[PDB]
Amino acid sequence: IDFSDPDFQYLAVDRKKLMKFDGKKNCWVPDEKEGFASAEIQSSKGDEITVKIVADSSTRTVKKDDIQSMNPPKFEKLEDMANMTYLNEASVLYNLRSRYTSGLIYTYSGLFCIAVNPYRRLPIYTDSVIAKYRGKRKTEIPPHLFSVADNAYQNMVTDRENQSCLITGESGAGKTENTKKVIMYLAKVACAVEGSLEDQIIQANPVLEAYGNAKTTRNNNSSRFGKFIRIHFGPTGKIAGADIETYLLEKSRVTYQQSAERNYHIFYQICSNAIPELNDVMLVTPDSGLYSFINQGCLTVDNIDDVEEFKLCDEAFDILGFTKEEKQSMFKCTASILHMGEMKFKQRPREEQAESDGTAEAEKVAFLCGINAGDLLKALLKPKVKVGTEMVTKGQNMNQVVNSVGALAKSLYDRMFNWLVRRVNKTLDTKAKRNYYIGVLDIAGFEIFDFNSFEQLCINYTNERLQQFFNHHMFILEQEEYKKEGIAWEFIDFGMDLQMCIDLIEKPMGILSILEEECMFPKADDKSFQDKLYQNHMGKNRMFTKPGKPTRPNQGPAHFELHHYAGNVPYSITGWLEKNKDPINENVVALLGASKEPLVAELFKAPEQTISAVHRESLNKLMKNLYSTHPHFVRCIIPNELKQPGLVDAELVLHQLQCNGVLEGIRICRKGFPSRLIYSEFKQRYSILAPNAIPQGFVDGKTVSEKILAGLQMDPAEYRLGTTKVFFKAGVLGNLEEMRDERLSKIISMFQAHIRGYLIRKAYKKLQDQRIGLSVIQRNIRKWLVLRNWQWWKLYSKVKPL
Amino acid sequence: PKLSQDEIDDLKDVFELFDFWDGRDGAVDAFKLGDVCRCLGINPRNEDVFAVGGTHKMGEKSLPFEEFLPAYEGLMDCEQGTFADYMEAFKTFDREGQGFISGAELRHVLTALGERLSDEDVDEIIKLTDLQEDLEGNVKYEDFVKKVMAGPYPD
Amino acid sequence: PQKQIQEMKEAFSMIDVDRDGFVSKEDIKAISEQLGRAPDDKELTAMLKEAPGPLNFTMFLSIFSDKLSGTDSEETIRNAFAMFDEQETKKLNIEYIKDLLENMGDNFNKDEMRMTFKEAPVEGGKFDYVKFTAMIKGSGEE
Numbered sequence A: 001i002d003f004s005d006p007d008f009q010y011l012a013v014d015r016k017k018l019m020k021f022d023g024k025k026n027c028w029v030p031d032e033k034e035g036f037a038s039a040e041i042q043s044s045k046g047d048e049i050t051v052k053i054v055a056d057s058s059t060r061t062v063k064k065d066d067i068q069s070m071n072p073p074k075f076e077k078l079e080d081m082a083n084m085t086y087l088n089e090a091s092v093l094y095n096l097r098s099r100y101t102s103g104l105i106y107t108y109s110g111l112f113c114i115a116v117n118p119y120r121r122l123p124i125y126t127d128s129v130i131a132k133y134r135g136k137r138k139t140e141i142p143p144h145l146f147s148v149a150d151n152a153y154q155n156m157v158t159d160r161e162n163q164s165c166l167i168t169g170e171s172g173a174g175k176t177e178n179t180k181k182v183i184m185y186l187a188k189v190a191c192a193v194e195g196s197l198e199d200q201i202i203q204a205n206p207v208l209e210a211y212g213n214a215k216t217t218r219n220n221n222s223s224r225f226g227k228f229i230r231i232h233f234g235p236t237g238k239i240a241g242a243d244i245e246t247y248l249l250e251k252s253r254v255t256y257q258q259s260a261e262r263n264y265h266i267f268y269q270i271c272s273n274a275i276p277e278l279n280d281v282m283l284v285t286p287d288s289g290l291y292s293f294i295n296q297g298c299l300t301v302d303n304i305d306d307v308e309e310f311k312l313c314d315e316a317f318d319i320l321g322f323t324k325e326e327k328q329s330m331f332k333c334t335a336s337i338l339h340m341g342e343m344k345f346k347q348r349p350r351e352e353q354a355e356s357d358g359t360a361e362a363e364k365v366a367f368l369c370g371i372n373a374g375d376l377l378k379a380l381l382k383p384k385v386k387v388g389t390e391m392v393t394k395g396q397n398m399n400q401v402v403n404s405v406g407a408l409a410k411s412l413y414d415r416m417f418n419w420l421v422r423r424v425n426k427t428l429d430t431k432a433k434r435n436y437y438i439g440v441l442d443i444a445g446f447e448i449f450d451f452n453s454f455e456q457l458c459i460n461y462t463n464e465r466l467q468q469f470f471n472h473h474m475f476i477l478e479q480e481e482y483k484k485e486g487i488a489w490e491f492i493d494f495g496m497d498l499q500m501c502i503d504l505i506e507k508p509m510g511i512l513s514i515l516e517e518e519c520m521f522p523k524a525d526d527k528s529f530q531d532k533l534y535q536n537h538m539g540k541n542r543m544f545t546k547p548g549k550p551t552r553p554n555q556g557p558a559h560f561e562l563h564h565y566a567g568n569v570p571y572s573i574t575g576w577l578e579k580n581k582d583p584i585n586e587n588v589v590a591l592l593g594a595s596k597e598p599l600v601a602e603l604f605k606a607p608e609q610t611i612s613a614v615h616r617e618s619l620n621k622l623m624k625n626l627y628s629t630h631p632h633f634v635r636c637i638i639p640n641e642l643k644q645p646g647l648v649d650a651e652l653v654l655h656q657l658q659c660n661g662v663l664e665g666i667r668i669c670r671k672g673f674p675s676r677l678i679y680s681e682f683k684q685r686y687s688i689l690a691p692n693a694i695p696q697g698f699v700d701g702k703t704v705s706e707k708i709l710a711g712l713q714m715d716p717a718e719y720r721l722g723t724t725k726v727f728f729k730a731g732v733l734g735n736l737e738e739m740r741d742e743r744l745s746k747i748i749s750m751f752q753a754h755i756r757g758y759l760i761r762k763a764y765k766k767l768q769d770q771r772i773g774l775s776v777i778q779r780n781i782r783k784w785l786v787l788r789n790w791q792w793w794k795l796y797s798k799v800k801p802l
Numbered sequence B: 001p002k003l004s005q006d007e008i009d010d011l012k013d014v015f016e017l018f019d020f021w022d023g024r025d026g027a028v029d030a031f032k033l034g035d036v037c038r039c040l041g042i043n044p045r046n047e048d049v050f051a052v053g054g055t056h057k058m059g060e061k062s063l064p065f066e067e068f069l070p071a072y073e074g075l076m077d078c079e080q081g082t083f084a085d086y087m088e089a090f091k092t093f094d095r096e097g098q099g100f101i102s103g104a105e106l107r108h109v110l111t112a113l114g115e116r117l118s119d120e121d122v123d124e125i126i127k128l129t130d131l132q133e134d135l136e137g138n139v140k141y142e143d144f145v146k147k148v149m150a151g152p153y154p155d
Numbered sequence C: 001p002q003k004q005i006q007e008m009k010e011a012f013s014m015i016d017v018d019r020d021g022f023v024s025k026e027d028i029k030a031i032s033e034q035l036g037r038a039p040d041d042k043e044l045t046a047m048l049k050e051a052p053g054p055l056n057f058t059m060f061l062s063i064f065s066d067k068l069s070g071t072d073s074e075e076t077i078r079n080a081f082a083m084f085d086e087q088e089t090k091k092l093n094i095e096y097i098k099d100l101l102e103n104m105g106d107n108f109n110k111d112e113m114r115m116t117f118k119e120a121p122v123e124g125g126k127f128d129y130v131k132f133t134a135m136i137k138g139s140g141e142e
Ligand SMILES: Nc1ncnc2c1ncn2[C@@H]1O[C@H](COP(=O)(O)OP(=O)(O)O)[C@@H](O)[C@H]1O
Pocket: A117, A118, A119, A120, A121, A122, A173, A174, A177, A178, A219, A220, A221, A222, A303, A643
């Protein structure tokens, strides 16, 4: 249970302090600065409803359908919005900032577990707290991340099934931190008895942070890659081990950076001079501004100590077991990507093709890479293309060459990072057998911009499968419930129209298909790719439409609109071709293939793969796993674009919720029988609606209910009767509420009126009496007056003292 | 609706008395129209009486008998609470389910909810019906209900 | 109607100032003039019609039983007043009885009021209906 306990300071709130409203007049209205607004209806003129806004007291006219139902105070800061009488855009947005401003950040909403970024550390993640969440159901304690994780663990042991926790959300919404916490908590409740294994699940973070993280306008330690971390357990439920999986790493970063943005921390640590002994091993000069692959955006970070973090990164590797030879191979390869960016070329000898302008850097590169600057540059200028039984020497200019370089850098980095991840797994892997696991996912959630490119599609298309994964689940849980209550009906899975958008993209005729195909061809371009797209899919697919225009002030170019469950998204295919396939000297690779440096060697060995083709493959892998597990969903949300705590930007939050999964989770769920009470509660709440119908003696609760509804002239559609509880279409309980208050009030008054009748009626008897009373009093006083004022009386009455 | 010339004889009876208590003159202050009906056995709601001509203050409108009838026959077609209507009503303040309720709550229900009752009026009907809160301070409303319903003079 | 009907005979002794077992249309004004103010002669003729038997002592009685007719007792009145005093204090408040007489029943007019309270017994706000009652019934004094 719970009371005043300190640990529950930022979890629960004073239910009594929240304890210190007309359904017909109170409601939500759209406000441009606050999303919605509280309002009291004034009049109506059809669709023309006019109201008053509590905050400024003004007036505005709003289309009836525009108006959204408001919840009674009875539902303030409700822990799980799945119970709120009115479940919508506004009633949700409200219940969210309300809690968040009171310090609350974990709010339930069905299967979801919405977590609003604090932007300040909180006393919620303490050991003692950890202990009161151990083994407790969710309705048995305040909404908390720990419960999603715990209820996950005790679900694994109890049911003997793999578990999957899916954290999602925009950038900077705090999903990495959530994931770490999830992991910590799992390690803190299933410990085993270099360093401890879990110590390494923990130290893997640094090195990965150094290569997958970077400072971005949104967040300061942004994971720029998707991650699927699995944690394995033994038969006694303790951690057997782990392993990792990455997804879409931001290769782009390696050579470009926007204003107020750095490259992966590693590059800056590398040039921190925190470990002087290595500067020579790497050939680096401890001033980052000097290098052209990182001197673009900013170089420092307010909360990042490019020097400390580097020393720690170093130890992390030592604690991970990487040999010094390995750790340094990494270091060398990384440093060499700084020289590649400081490798310049000349173009106009007398002939008009390119040629190197110095070797000094090219050499430093070839040194750290283990090659021949001669062979290197020779190949970087006049490559050896190959086709059939002939290998030609193609010439390329500045552009083609400088772009080749950058491609080599990107390619190298990706290859490297992937190796590192595989490496780390080798560590974190165990040679003991594992019974079951629980995997934590964490990839950027759906997001739409003014300009959505190939990247955005890749991400949205992903969450697309992901979201479809949820709907499926909901669909399953709904059925088992209906079947449970002998009331199962008109169904079909929720992952339905989610499938078409999906096929339009991953299936054979699909979009990504046209992109991967058009990439084997030489002189193909936007227009050729664009052509083929419209060709196969235009005016033939409802999900694929031509650009309609702007739904927001700074939006930009677009070629096609994709109908995602989150809404139609304008994607511009400009660049996709160059982006999908990674041009790199098939030659340079041959040279680095034969490098003498052991790591560079692994990095470029020969096979027997385009971005789009790689991802859909490793995504197929993922989903096949996720579907063989038991879901849990954690929706991360950013309050504002100021890292300011408490500040809540409505448009921003409303937005997220849309592509978040919540509002759809509400919708797919709305088509069933959302609001559902159990006959007991129904009786003690709605008997007031049909007193004169309840035979009198404590009858069975479904009969009381079977009657209240029957007598209420309840339309069979609006509801359906379980065996344990009664289900209702959405917002019906709403009507049953208003209808409940009108009556209750009227009943009271009818009683107050019966009482007033009792009184008066009682005084009647006295009024009947008092009449004759005053009737006497009045009349006599009148006789006496005429007497006294009689000419014969004063005369007479004077005629006698004698 | 239509009235028994007998049920009309009862009304003149009462209408007269009331005409008298603000001076005999064949008229009755509208602000008594409710009260006159009550003396007949009708249990109007304020909203009901203000709706047929009743007024808020003493001395705004005055009604010959001629108009009382139409007004009276109107109050008859109104809602009169039943035992159950009241029971379930009160039952909604009773958490436990034993049939008790903080006399305070009760005082609250009547003076704060619906069309509020004047404390002088509540204080008045606790004595008349003779409601008595147990040691802890709670009342058994089922009794308080049938009392009011019973009337000043039982059987 | 018992012992003072003999006193109406004693109050026949001054009726009969000039002793003729009767009183002319001016015999009356003579007795009146001998002590206070003097009645009209047209207050002597215009009333020629109230004597079903001219006038003596046994006609002074019977030409007055037209005014003392329609009265209620001393206990009947001191009970009508008792209908507005549930606390048995033998006293109505002043503003109360006044309101009672002026605005309910057969509403007294500005005058009848002015005249009824002119000599009404009222001490510190309370109107004594008991004592007041006597005044109205000759058990006290007007
Ligand atoms: N659950 C949380 N609890 C406390 N702070 C959080 C939480 N989630 C996000 N934050 C905020 O996120 C930011 C962390 O940014 P970042 O530099 O990327 O992380 P780190 O400190 O691990 O390097 C901080 O400003 C912090 O207040």
